[PDB]
Symmetry: C3
Subunit: 471 residues, 3 copies
Amino acid sequence: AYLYGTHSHGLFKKLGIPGPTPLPFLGNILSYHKGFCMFDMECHKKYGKVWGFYDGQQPVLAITDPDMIKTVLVKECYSVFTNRRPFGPVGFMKSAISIAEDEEWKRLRSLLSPTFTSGKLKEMVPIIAQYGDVLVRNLRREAETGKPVTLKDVFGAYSMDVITSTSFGVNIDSLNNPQDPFVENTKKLLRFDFLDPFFLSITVFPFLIPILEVLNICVFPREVTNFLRKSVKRMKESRLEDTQKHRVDFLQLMIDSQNSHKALSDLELVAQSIIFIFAGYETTSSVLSFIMYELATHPDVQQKLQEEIDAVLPNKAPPTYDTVLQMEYLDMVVNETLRLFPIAMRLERVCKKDVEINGMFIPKGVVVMIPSYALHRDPKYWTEPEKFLPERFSKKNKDNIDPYIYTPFGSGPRNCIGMRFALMNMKLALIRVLQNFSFKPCKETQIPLKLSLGGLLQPEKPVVLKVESRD
Amino acid sequence: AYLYGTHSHGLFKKLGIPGPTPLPFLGNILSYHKGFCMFDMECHKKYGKVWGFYDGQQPVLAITDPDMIKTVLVKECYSVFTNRRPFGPVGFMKSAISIAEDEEWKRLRSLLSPTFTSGKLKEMVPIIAQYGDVLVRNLRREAETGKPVTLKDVFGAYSMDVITSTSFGVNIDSLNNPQDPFVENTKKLLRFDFLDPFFLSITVFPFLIPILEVLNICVFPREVTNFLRKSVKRMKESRLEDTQKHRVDFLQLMIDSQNSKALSDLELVAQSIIFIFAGYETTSSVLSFIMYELATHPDVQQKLQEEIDAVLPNKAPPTYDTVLQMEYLDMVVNETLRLFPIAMRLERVCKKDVEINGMFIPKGVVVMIPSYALHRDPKYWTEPEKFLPERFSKKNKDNIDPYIYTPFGSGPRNCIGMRFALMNMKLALIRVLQNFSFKPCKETQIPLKLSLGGLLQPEKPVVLKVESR
Amino acid sequence: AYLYGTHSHGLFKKLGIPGPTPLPFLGNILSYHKGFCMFDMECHKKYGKVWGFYDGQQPVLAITDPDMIKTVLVKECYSVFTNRRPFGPVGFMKSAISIAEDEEWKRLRSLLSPTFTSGKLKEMVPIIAQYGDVLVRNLRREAETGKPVTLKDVFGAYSMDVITSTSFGVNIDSLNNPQDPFVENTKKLLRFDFLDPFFLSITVFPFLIPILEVLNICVFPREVTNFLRKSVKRMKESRLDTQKHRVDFLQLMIDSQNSHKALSDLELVAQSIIFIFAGYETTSSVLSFIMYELATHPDVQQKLQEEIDAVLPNKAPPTYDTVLQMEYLDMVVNETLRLFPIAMRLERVCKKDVEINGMFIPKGVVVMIPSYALHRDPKYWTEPEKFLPERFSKKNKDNIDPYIYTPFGSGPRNCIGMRFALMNMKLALIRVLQNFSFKPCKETQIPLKLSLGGLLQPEKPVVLKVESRD
Ligand code: HEM
Ligand code: HEM
Ligand code: HEM
Ligand SMILES: Cc1ncc2n1-c1ccc(Cl)cc1C(c1ccccc1F)=NC2
Ligand SMILES: Cc1ncc2n1-c1ccc(Cl)cc1C(c1ccccc1F)=NC2
Ligand SMILES: Cc1ncc2n1-c1ccc(Cl)cc1C(c1ccccc1F)=NC2
């Protein structure tokens, strides 16, 4: 992207922007020993408002100023900062919203938009909540042996359960049969760190893109894609001549959208389905494990929230859309877990053409990066950043929060499209389990929690906790 | 090759298997700073019995259990653990047994194992004994004129000498005639770290193969091999066919087994080249190591400096069946091979998804047996950094596990010329100290630091004072 | 190049040559954390007269013996050490003299040589001197405040001005007319570290060249050079109007085309481009370093100031002969270039197995002369860390070995632009020092830290306090 892949390491010196000294070829990849999080944290304090670094040959400029951020994510979204890091030849996956660029993306965003509206989310709630009953079901069985529960298993399965049932309408008990046709293939597909900036080695060695295109050597081969392409083949047609309708999954919502910009294709439809899995599986599972960790080790908050839930759903009353949005304190806790642990942890935009944003020149082909994780813990926005304090998100405390500093779902036209859905999904899980159980740490518990080194935040060791069937 | 060459640095943490945390793209190669062995060492002593690491993008799973190693090298060798690391486009050398994969490997390994019967190694010992007497004759060079002697020079030239006549039927003194186009061309050939996992850039950039293949970039050009190929083509076309000065060497044996589906001529030269790579620096290295151990541990040297004349007194031609006799020497060798397994590692590519013993191994992963770190594993050897030859002699040593001591590996895909290299070295070793003796020079390295590279070797070349007899 | 791009790390241990122990793939790249200079320095002390290391897969043999250096750079230049590192698909820039190899380079060097004579320099001086005036004006404005001056802003501007005027025969004020299309576009071109060994992943990924050649993937695309190329096509056809004819590098190269085979039209543009790479950052950097050295050594500065006044009294304008007269000026330039050779090192690929002065060198290896290290080697220089213009006095003539001291290389493939580069720097030097005095301020970087890259540069731009005179 940047300078046709040529040596770039003198760029931030020309531009007069501080940053770590690069090695030839590698740039600052060695600086990644502490991980993305600690790297960005270190750099922020050391270099200040703004700093450049090099992922191999790819220059990355990090911005912290809220007005600079707004310019990148919002004002100049469509004009200059429309895309993310460039991707390899992934075949038809090219037309997945997350890999789509420029006009293609723009079209695809506009088509996928009405699928994620609040109104149509309300209609999925029945299907999600039923796996909130399935979650507690499988989670009670461990609370009677009184043993350690690995939460990235019980939530992994829940994330999986919701995805399969909302993405394809395929209904499964994941924890109890991992040999189910779908689950094994989904988890196989899920092996690929598709959206990681180190998925291939484009950063170091950028020529990899043009070479692989021209040789049509595909790095996401038909073999991987086939199973779900056939499931969607036999799905579109088969169960959908029922007349009786019913279907409320993502598939149907997209199927329904194909008639009277514009016109979503079959292969396109499929690519959104796949991309939804990548977006939702490990992310949702992780936020859940992160939430329970904070709750289990803060028993005050747990009970306080635990009584707020019983106060609006008396008698473990089944959760409903309207009464989910009812719960302020539940919302304060999700937002705070995500403040500490923004699973993306970094937001990125390639700069399409030379530009001057709030005073600063940015050359074409650069990656403009917003360090979410670092900014979420920036003392110059939050008092006691390292401390988990659901209190910051009380409405007596909403103006103080800057939407361009708190960015767990990004911002602007290219933010998270399934934010509403991610938030609704996780809350229905939380509500159900918290109603029926209290969660407590034991010595088997990684305390304090260590983090994933890589690009996508995750507990370093699986979150393990002891569960009591309760009041 | 693993997960379509794609980012893989999530496996070992997603399988509970510990190991050093990898850098993006590099994986763990920064850890190679210590060398292959010293890495396997600190990893063993840290993560315990099983650990993974990443060679660039290539996920490498190291196993220490004898049962594991047995399932790998022996049980599942035909079905799961058939091949080593994939190779780049190498032309006709795809036929070399070391490069060949699956059943296509098997056909070859079949056509070959006859050639390595002890009933054929036997009739070979004359042609190689020739060089023992060439080695010692050379070696009296600077033993007599009085000066520190660097042993690699005379051991290198020796190992070179055996291979030439045994792989190609050509007797040369490589040290005295160093401009012989043969010695010239095979040393040109031995520049290539061919069997090294880092020969090319596969590990860190696994997309290299399909690219080099399609574009027909040759990594090992016909030029390199032209002189050997079109030499065999003269030793084997016009041949020793019209005449019958019937010689006993690897070349003729293969030639003969073409007149018994079969083996082609280029399939033939393919094997000869391989025997050089397999034979040359390994045979040299072990000798140097053995000589380090004796010179510095003088009591064991004399203990068979004329227990060597108790069998053949004195200065007798070491005929095959007199060399299998010396069981103490036999296991003096074994101890250097313990202390120094040249391979350092054993490696197999898991051809497809399986769970063996209690452990799951997904397709495309390298299962690696760290031969070195076992040979110095205190859990199996009292005083592991010892040089104590007879921890290996008698039915005293039914405790030697053929999975923990495997400096030639095990199962179908172990060292096919084990018996040859062992015979080669032993026979060489007799006709050196039965004429000389060695003292730690005023320049020798103690303790012996090794080479960081993929083929085990002394850091500095070994230097010893050599004496009269 | 080397052994078909195959693994090469075993070589130097084998040849009996010492050096830092490589890593798989990366060779000794991690040692560049120091930068080229400090790496060469520590290797020099640690390893001795000759050492070897690996730029990824690329073996590099470093040599220090003058006899050995004379052999590589001069004697076996045409036979064995004719080229630098290989390049890969760059389009019409293949015929750029710095990129050409073998027979093509010999032809280009021969065709360009008459352009770089001292005579043609003499007639160029009047043109390139009108930019010292612009320099003095530009600088004054920054000094007219009292705020510290980042020299790079004023020397960068100056270096730019001269090159685009000489190489493309135009007259612009890049500091004041930054949106002049020549300025924009020469700045575009200057983004590429064109001649840097790490321009591409070639050192670490040696198959890149053949892969890119067969697949016609261009690294220097042609939108990068379009404006400037098309400029030459509209500029030469306008001068021949056979009446007026400037003496710049463009004219001299058009002159050469008329009445061994003559310079092509695309070859002409190729050169003009390469002269920008060769002249822009180098001149800027050397000018900065000199000023750093004058401002920290006030005694030398003033001594130089009185020479300049005694030959050009009352701020007289420089001329070819009056520049060459200034002995101390020459010593000062030489001494800075000794401490700060911009190239940091000279390289030549070994085309063919040779024994040079008794040491075997295989085909494919880069032989490298560690210029930065040799300029600071105690064996040849007393207190090599000290700035001492006197090393280059007349009295101190042939204590300077011309294979030790190589700010401009040596032999047939040395700097073709040397005489010019020196004239150019001295011209500007004269004018700034006729008008100004330069003192450190709080913001100067003492001690000086050097760039880590392949083209020597101050790490922080040189900031100084600048006073007027009169
Ligand atoms: C589980 C918690 C989740 C978090 C923390 C999360 C966070 C994010 C973030 C930070 C981005 C990047 C936004 C930007 O660059 O400005 C993003 C993008 C995206 N997310 Fe999510 N997400 C989550 C779940 C989901 C789910 C369940 C879906 C739907 C299946 C989804 C669909 C997407 C899509 C499609 C994009 C790309 C938008 C585009 O390029 O047009 N996310 N998400
Ligand atoms: C000190 C001397 C030698 C040692 C320590 C040695 C050791 C080894 C080891 C450890 C292996 C791999 C075992 C495995 O992965 O299962 C091997 C493979 C091999 N060795 Fe040797 N070797 C030596 C000399 C020789 C000689 C002289 C030859 C023949 C001229 C030879 C031919 C081979 C071949 C052909 C293979 C692989 C064949 C196949 O994959 O089927 N080796 N050796
Ligand atoms: C003070 C500034 C300069 C310095 C220190 C400098 C130094 C050098 C050095 C060290 C080399 C390599 C010589 C070798 O390998 O032996 C070189 C080559 C070269 N320089 Fe310069 N140079 C400078 C300015 C210029 C200018 C202004 C031009 C032309 C306008 C120029 C044109 C070249 C060319 C064309 C080559 C390559 C010669 C060939 O391959 O035939 N240089 N220079
Ligand atoms: C889906 C999707 N499409 C585009 C994005 N994403 C995305 C969604 C959620 C999260 Cl937590 C990260 C990303 C990521 C992401 C960042 C680093 C590593 C892996 C990722 F998926 N990038 C933006
Ligand atoms: C022949 C052959 N084919 C496959 C192997 N080998 C092999 C044979 C003998 C030796 Cl002494 C090492 C190796 C090696 C080896 C390992 C690392 C670096 C160089 C090697 F030759 N072995 C695996
Ligand atoms: C123009 C040109 N053509 C060929 C050369 N050069 C050159 C000229 C001047 C300078 Cl100071 C360096 C070089 C360089 C050079 C070396 C390392 C990094 C950048 C360079 F321009 N090398 C030899």
